[PDB]
Amino acid sequence: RTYPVEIAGVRRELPIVQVGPGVAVALLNLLGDTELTEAAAEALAKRLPPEVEVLVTPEVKAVPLAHALSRITGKPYVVARKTEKPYMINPVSRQVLSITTGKPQLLVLDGADIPRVRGKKVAIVDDVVSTGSTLAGLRELIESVGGEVVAVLAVFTEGTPRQDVVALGHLP
Amino acid sequence: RTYPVEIAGVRRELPIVQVGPGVAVALLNLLGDTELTEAAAEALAKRLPPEVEVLVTPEVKAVPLAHALSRITGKPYVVARKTEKPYMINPVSRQVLSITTGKPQLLVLDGADIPRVRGKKVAIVDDVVSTGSTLAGLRELIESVGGEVVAVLAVFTEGTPRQDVVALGHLPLF
Amino acid sequence: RTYPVEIAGVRRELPIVQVGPGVAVALLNLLGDTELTEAAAEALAKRLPPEVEVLVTPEVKAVPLAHALSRITGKPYVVARKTEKPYMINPVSRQVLSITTGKPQLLVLDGADIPRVRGKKVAIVDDVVSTGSTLAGLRELIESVGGEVVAVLAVFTEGTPRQDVVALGHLPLF
């Protein structure tokens, strides 16, 4: 049915979704929930290890997180995408860098974004850091681009990965 | 090379791509850019008709704007997508709405968002209204739901405003 | 996935649930939707003969259409229920009028609403006229009490009446 969560005094009741069949897998949904998104951003900002330089987030529903967390902390963010995007082999998102992921997936940073991360202490930022699957792939992408991953932050964790995170909560 | 725009005292040199025959407009990418997004939203916030009750966009580079517009305006926002998104045919983002487009496109509202937009004075917000071949279909998805588009907002118009708009500048085609 | 419909101006995308193993629907309820209720009621009031003196609905969630139709038109409305609803074996209400249905169900008229029906010309009001498994029974309480049914009004139908229905539109399967 539905799963209780609250972040910094904002209460919600997430719908349990099936990707893994039957289990208690809460759906997080920042796209269109401004009040959740800032309450997450305020609470995650104060966990942000001091002087960190650049935030990095993969596609879907963390860009309102990263923006709002970017706003609070005066620090840029970068959106890697789950695919190569319109106008990439072009002068507009010029020279995309790609790598795979174990469960077929393909994380990519715009070439225009590599100079904001290279040489920098990177904080990876995601709405949910789940199995630890795309995370390892993401980290090596950044480390092949120049970047030093210092801190990973999220709204929630889910299950038991090989990489540690800074979340408020945890979802089964 | 690199077109110079000024948006609420924000100089950004936006990179130029040719989608038509030779003609070329700069692509706003509001994703990496925390400063432009908040410049634009504060600007656009002043020009929202007070009687607007909810903001709408498509998923891509623009949702930084609708969020920033929602924060300052107090009014919620709703994100249409180019497809039924992963975890949309699942027991969760269920019963999605769908239409098609004359430009190569498709525009979906999630079923779980029809309960805002229903009977509501809607304002479309996008990063750039191009042809706005997307824009036509957005009004037909919104109106589908029971929605009442009373505004159409963007950081930029391009070519000219295809149906009735107010924005923050117009973009040429190099 | 969804079915568009409309009533005098008011268009809605209605989700396609399923009740049983075969068919789907289009789901309609008037409960938290004021505007569709209002637009339903005035439109149906144009199709009310003046000879109807009272309006009978069987449970929620048609009561907002019954409430509104009564107001615009001026004539009373009566809510039949699925059970002996309280406080109805007491000095307040007593002596409910039951009847079978099939579906496995009861249709009850409060004792104090036989006077609102007895001697009178009656219009059944409902949201959707599905089969009418909860309708011919309705008739045979109205008829028992004293009322004589001269009109079925629903927002919607599913095949065509079975028992003749003035309805604002029609709804397929899947």
Add this chain to the structure above:
Amino acid sequence: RTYPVEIAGVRRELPIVQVGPGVAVALLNLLGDTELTEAAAEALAKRLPPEVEVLVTPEVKAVPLAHALSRITGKPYVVARKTEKPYMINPVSRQVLSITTGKPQLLVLDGADIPRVRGKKVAIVDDVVSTGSTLAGLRELIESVGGEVVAVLAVFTEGTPRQDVVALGHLPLF
């Protein structure tokens, strides 16, 4: 026998019953009574705090009250029920949220309705407030969603103020 009252220029003599054993309670039934209903709605709409954005009621007999109040205030209403309601098992009225309440009851709030309560300042509307455990329960339900209760309305407070309702009259116990 029966207890008199008047509500906003409408006179009624309302019957008595065993709610508690001896303590004999006035019965207020806005079902079927459009005039008492609509006279109440108008005189409670003037009392409404303007920053209330949505109305919520437990079951009938307040959906006449609440729809009416949606009409005249021009803002949505939502309807909790005593059970998960058909649409129940095949989820479209999906993922319903429940809370128990210690005078044997579920209050349940349909899943389609949480995008309407969430982030919204809310007012409860009842026909008759007394226990204050159903209402405290409803507060627990609303708050669950992301909602904020900022006001309680009713026709009649009864006994004495537990939670501080903004009523029209007030009832004794007989």
Add this chain to the structure above:
Amino acid sequence: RTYPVEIAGVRRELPIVQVGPGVAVALLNLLGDTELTEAAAEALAKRLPPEVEVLVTPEVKAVPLAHALSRITGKPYVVARKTEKPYMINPVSRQVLSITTGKPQLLVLDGADIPRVRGKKVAIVDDVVSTGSTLAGLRELIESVGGEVVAVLAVFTEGTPRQDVVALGHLPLF
């Protein structure tokens, strides 16, 4: 000792019965007078103001008047009594409402009759409307319950009464 009178062109000789010789009550009886009741009711029907929904008479000799008036006019009528009548504190004639009067009497609407009066435009019907206590008694009983008295119909008036009327003539006391 007799009072001649012409009522809608029917001639009668009313007996003059003792209040006391001087103050001479001339009494009309309709119990058994088919020609007069029909004439009087056909004459008052052309005089019924057309917002009227229901007719209410006090107990006694006035019901052929009310009957004959409901029939040609096409709306119901109610008969208040002077005492508790058989089968009242039961599930039959459930829960009569009361009030006393000055001039020697008590007045009682059967509970099964308040649904036919509640929220309606009532016309009072009597054979002879006279002083005040009995009419004002019936007025307060009507409006207790939720009726609005919008007319007072009668064969005669008498004195020049405490309330205001449409009638076929007027009676002194000699």
Add this chain to the structure above:
Amino acid sequence: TYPVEIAGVRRELPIVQVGPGVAVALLNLLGDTELTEAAAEALAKRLPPEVEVLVTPEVKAVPLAHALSRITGKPYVVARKTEKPYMINPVSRQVLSITTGKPQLLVLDGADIPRVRGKKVAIVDDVVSTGSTLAGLRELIESVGGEVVAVLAVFTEGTPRQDVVALGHLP
């Protein structure tokens, strides 16, 4: 409770004991303009032409006898269960009485006595059960000067040893 039919018109006349017992279903014609009109036109077929005048007792039978009187075109007369306003002063003539097993003690108002004395009479009522009034009334109509050729009604109740070729029956 006990559902009925009177030439179309259907009703649920509700339960209350005068019997032990059982559960008796009151008619009151005072409520219902349609039923009365339905039972009066349906009782209007039954009348003999030998009837020239209708007589009742107080209860719920004056709407009936009125409508019946309207369509047949013959008078009706009402007798009263008890005393009425100013019944020893001039307006309301004096009793003829009988004391039944039922707690009852009945009267007529001889204002009407010229309308009966010499004419052929018929009784109408809303229920006939024990027939408490019946012989008494009939003796009052003897006492005056009229012959009772018939005892019409809406409803027979029980199995009245009287000839009440009615419209229907109740337990």
